[PDB]
Amino acid sequence: QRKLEALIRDPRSPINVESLLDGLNSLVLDLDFPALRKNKNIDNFLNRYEKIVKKIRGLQMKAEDYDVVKVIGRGAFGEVQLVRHKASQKVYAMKLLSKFEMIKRSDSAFFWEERDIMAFANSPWVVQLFYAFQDDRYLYMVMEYMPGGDLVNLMSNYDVPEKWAKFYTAEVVLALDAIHSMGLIHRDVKPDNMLLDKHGHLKLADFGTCMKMDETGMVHCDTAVGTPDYISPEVLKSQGGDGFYGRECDWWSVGVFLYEMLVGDTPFYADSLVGTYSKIMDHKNSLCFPEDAEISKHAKNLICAFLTDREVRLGRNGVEEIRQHPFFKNDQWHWDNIRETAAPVVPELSSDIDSSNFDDIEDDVETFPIPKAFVGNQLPFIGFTYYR
Amino acid sequence: QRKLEALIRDPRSPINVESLLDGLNSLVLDLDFPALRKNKNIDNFLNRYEKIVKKIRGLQMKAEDYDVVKVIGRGAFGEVQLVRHKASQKVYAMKLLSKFEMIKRSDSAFFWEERDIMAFANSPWVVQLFYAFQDDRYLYMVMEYMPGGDLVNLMSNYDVPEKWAKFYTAEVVLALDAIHSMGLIHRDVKPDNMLLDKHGHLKLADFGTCMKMDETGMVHCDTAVGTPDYISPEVLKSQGGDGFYGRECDWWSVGVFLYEMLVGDTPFYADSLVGTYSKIMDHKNSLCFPEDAEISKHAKNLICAFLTDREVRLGRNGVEEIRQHPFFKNDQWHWDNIRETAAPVVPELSSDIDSSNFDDIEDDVETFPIPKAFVGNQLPFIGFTYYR
Ligand SMILES: NCc1ccc(Oc2ccc3c(c2)B(O)OC3)c(F)c1
Ligand SMILES: NCc1ccc(Oc2ccc3c(c2)B(O)OC3)c(F)c1
């Protein structure tokens, strides 16, 4: 009778208070309908709790506590908004995820690992999450705002020297090492999910595709997860069932990354997905540099090191072999202190709501149909709420 | 964001932790069925919480923490058991209430007031409740054990003098005054629900029929609640709709009580319910003493005082008029100290599990059918769990 309390005090546990509240709240949201209320038990339940649940809901953190400055990103499950918290006037980034879409597109569990990583990493490479909350429509995540934009934007606005590539890649390595050391594989590494902070130092951003490893160091996965241009071949083949893979796959991607950075296009680019896949599987005979784009011998090697079968891939036998590859030899920074050194491009920013390093998003509302019997659409999202 | 915590810390509140747990637990109990688990959302929910809920359930207080010494009472919703708590070896009385029967007989909300009264009265006249807990089958209430039995038993085993009647009635008065002062009407006063403690002093026992009063001091009730022999006529007539009644009705019953005690039969006894009702409505011309049973002039008056219309009933204008009625004049005790004086009959008891003052109960299992859709049978019982 003494453990239990600590169970509920524990911020990491699924039956800590906020989750329990999520419970009453999601239960109520999922039972309060005229059709279901024809059931006495459901009716006489709601009469008891419908009131205090509303009150609770008010005391909670809510979307209206924040001003929305501007939408800095948008995708198929929601948006990311620049915001300012009213009472404190502090600026944040806030990710909205449509509960309606997640149910519809049957993809309603990809955020747990994102939650816990951002909540608990306590790492300079992992964008921090301060609060996680929700309402009948969305999930919200309040994050430290990374004002530097992403590496896509940098590469879109720069011909990148190696001196720089050596830096950013280095930082990607340490970042991926942190996640790996937490027992997780990133699975969707790419400049898109690499954000530069106020000083121009990377943090990994989107973790919707993360997965925990075995006591060994592997994942049994039967679905391909990732983004065509950067998917490694071990992960592509896993699709066809019985796939047993590990962290090596992220290093593949770190590979493509550096190619993209230096050469200027992706190393398996195509006019199609089939044309990207089929060519990634032929990585042996398909990877090739332009003569004109003269990348160095050391840089050339690091790429090919990553771009090969998993059994021979740089990183197969530790991160150490990666770190001490000679392409990372330089005067500017050591691996002890890279993130406290003067990054290649420091963001010019006017104010705490300067979002110039992000593109302008357009702006151009769909909710669940009323149920006739109990379907339980809010059940997937119980345990999501989190307070610093 | 600061109130809320205190809300949940508050033992009186419905969203205090135990209730929240009751929530997850009852949700799980009501969703874990093959039929419903064909619903993805319900399935993928249970997979997350089914495990820790079981663990929680183990850490909880449970029926197996108690030995069952013997069944000291049984009725249509359950039993009352003498018990001993294993770890502490302390004896208690424990009331079981069948969840299955309460759903079936559509009477699943009569225990809340019983819970709170016994939990929170902090009164010598109100049997104390130490813990309230539950499982898929029953509700359990762990109470201080009243080893003296009830006043039915005493009257069954004694020709009662007035000196005694003056005492017990007195104690009933103070007891009913306490409940009244808590904003509640008892509605089922009768010796059955009067238990003598170790020293032979009354406490009121069953509160399944209690009701809170208005800011005025009344109850709007359209159902007759009580037990034929002791129902007052105002409450009988309330049945026929539009009944507005108050605490006076308990004093009616305190009336019958004293009659039963002194004369030896109930003052509206019959071979039937119709014969009991119809005769209670004629209380004007129907109440009458036996000449042989010579009750005193003062005692005679107190009865008739209670046994009359509500508008003229002793107690209509306060408890004071009751207290200083001359039938209560005596040398033994004052109203300041009655309960610390030497009761009329002190229980002879051999051990802490002596239940000689209770009858032997026989002993001669019916649970819910598996649901096909969500019905919510555990919803009525969310918020019942309580720990000292
Ligand atoms: N897979 C593409 C992607 C990249 C980044 C995403 O999230 C963001 C976007 C922008 C910012 C942040 C987080 B953040 O913490 O500061 C600014 C995001 F939601 C999706
Ligand atoms: N309406 C009849 C009735 C009377 C008393 C009831 O409960 C009991 C019975 C016996 C005991 C207790 C409580 B208790 O706290 O000590 C002994 C009870 F459950 C029903």
Overall form of chain A: globular
What pair of chains forms the biggest interface? A-B, 41 and 41 residues
Q: How many DSSP helices of chain A?
A: 14
Give the spatial strand order of the biggest sheet of chain A: 1-2-3-5-4-12
What would you give as the CATH superfamily of the largest domain in chain A? Transferase(Phosphotransferase) domain 1
Strand content of chain A: 5-15%
The CATH topology of the largest domain in chain A corresponds to Transferase(Phosphotransferase), domain 1
Number of strands of chain A: 12
What percent of the residues of chain A sit in helical stretches (DSSP H or I)?
A: 25-40%
User: Which ions and ligands are bound to the chains?
Assistant: the ligand NCc1ccc(Oc2ccc3c(c2)B(O)OC3)c(F)c1
Report the order of strands and helices of chain A. Answer: HHHHEEEHHEEHHEEEEEHEHHHHHE
Domain unit count of chain A: 2
What is the terminal separation of chain A in angstroms?
A: 27 Å
Please state the oligomeric state of the protein chains shown: homodimer
CATH class of the largest domain in chain A: Mainly Alpha
- What's the alpha carbon Rg of chain A, rounded to whole Å? 23 Å
Please identify, by name, the CATH architecture of the largest domain in chain A. Answer: Orthogonal Bundle
Structural class of chain A: alpha+beta
Biggest sheet layout of chain A: 6 strands, antiparallel
Family (chains A, B): Belongs to the protein kinase superfamily. AGC Ser/Thr protein kinase family.
Region (Interaction with NPM1) (chains A, B): 347-388
Domain AGC-kinase C-terminal (chains A, B): 331-388
Binding site for ATP (chains A, B): 72-80, 95
